[PDB]
């Protein structure tokens, strides 16, 4: 009663795998954040009485969220840290690993609990994304590719869009992205702040 859901990773990255700078995001793309919130919050209409998605994030990512914005609303948040702890929040869940977070979640939101888990997302940062990529239950990446080599200081840890990984990681058709996300999703390049980005979905067989 532990390995019955697959994990999905969601990330916005440049073409050089850049994800962050100065402990935040090195762009401010309101439509991209709005895509993030929709994908991570979407629960099919039949289920959205009692079901919620989960966002799993590293301690530095938790600290990068503006104070007045965390925990991230309408999702079950869990912060991963090896220091139990001082953290903070709000009744905020924490765990010392991805698997400890899963155990915590299945124990807390058990078959009887009023709130039920729908999908579980890993939402960053690089260190946690590294652990997610090694996890046997991770099978899907929702990537926003940012077509600009923006200066970054933190990078996505595995070059999953590169030739060396292309027998393992496959890019899905846009209709399949829409069907998974449950809504119409812009197709191809969007321009905001004078650079182009686009939404992709990649999968790995379990
Ligand atoms: N999509 C995007 O573009 C995203 C970008 N970001 C960016 O990423 C940067 C944050 O990345 P990063 O510095 O790698 O930080 P993380 O958010 O991965 O925080 C790392 C910390 O979280 C804990 N942690 C992470 N992985 C594990 C693990 N497997 N087991 C136990 N503890 C773990 C540790 O906490 P402790 O030290 O407490 O033990 C570690 O010090 C920021 O710039 C942020 O803006 C973040 C999310 C999305
Ligand atoms: C605007 C506030 C609520 C906010 C601040 C930071 C973030 N982060 C960490 C963030 C922001 N955008 C993101 N975009 C994608 N595609 N994927 C991610 N994992 C991602 C993560 C999200 C929301």
UniProtKB/Swiss-Prot annotation:
Write out the pathway annotation from the protein's UniProt entry: Cofactor biosynthesis; tetrahydrofolate biosynthesis; 5,6,7,8-tetrahydrofolate from 7,8-dihydrofolate: step 1/1
Q: Where is the DHFR domain?
A: 6-204
Q: Kindly list the positions annotated as binding substrate.
A: 32-37, 75
UniProt KW keywords: NADP, One-carbon metabolism, Oxidoreductase
What molecular function terms (GO) are annotated for this protein? dihydrofolate reductase activity; NADP binding
Q: Which CDD domains match?
A: DHFR
Name the enzyme group at the top EC level.
oxidoreductase
Q: What is its EC number?
A: 1.5.1.3
Q: Superkingdom, according to UniProt?
A: Eukaryota
Binding site residues for NADP(+):
12, 18-24, 59-61, 81-83, 124-131
Q: Name one GO cellular component term.
A: mitochondrion
Q: What InterPro entries does the record tag this protein with?
A: DHFR (IPR012259), DHFR-like_dom_sf (IPR024072), DHFR_CS (IPR017925), DHFR_dom (IPR001796)
One GO biological process term: tetrahydrofolate biosynthetic process
Catalysed reactions, semicolon-separated = (6S)-5,6,7,8-tetrahydrofolate + NADP(+) = 7,8-dihydrofolate + NADPH + H(+)
What is the purpose of this protein? Key enzyme in folate metabolism. Catalyzes an essential reaction for de novo glycine and purine synthesis, and for DNA precursor synthesis.
Entry's family note: Belongs to the dihydrofolate reductase family.
- Name of the protein described by the UniProt record: Dihydrofolate reductase
């Amino acid at each position: 009663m532990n390995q019955q859901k697959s994990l999905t990773l969601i990330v916005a990255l440049t073409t050089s795998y850049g994800i962050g700078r100065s402990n935040s995001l090195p762009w401010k793309l309101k439509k991209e954040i709005s895509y993030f919130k929709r994908v991570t919050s979407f629960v099919p209409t039949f289920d959205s009485f009692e079901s919620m998605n989960v966002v799993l994030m590293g301690r530095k990512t938790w600290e990068s969220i503006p104070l007045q914005n965390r925990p991230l609303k309408g999702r079950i948040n869990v912060v991963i840290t090896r220091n139990e702890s001082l953290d903070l929040g709000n009744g905020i869940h924490s765990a010392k690993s991805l698997d400890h977070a899963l155990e915590l979640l299945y124990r807390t939101y058990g078959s009887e609990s009023s709130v039920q888990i729908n999908r579980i997302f890993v939402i960053g940062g690089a260190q946690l994304y590294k652990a997610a990529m090694d996890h046997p239950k991770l099978d899907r990446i929702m990537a926003t590719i940012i077509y600009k080599d923006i200066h970054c200081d933190v990078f996505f840890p595995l070059k999953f869009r590169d030739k060396e990984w292309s027998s393992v990681w496959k890019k899905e058709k846009h209709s399949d992205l829409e069907s998974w996300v449950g809504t119409k999703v812009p197709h191809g390049k969007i321009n905001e702040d004078g650079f182009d980005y686009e939404f992709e979905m990649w999968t790995r067989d379990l």
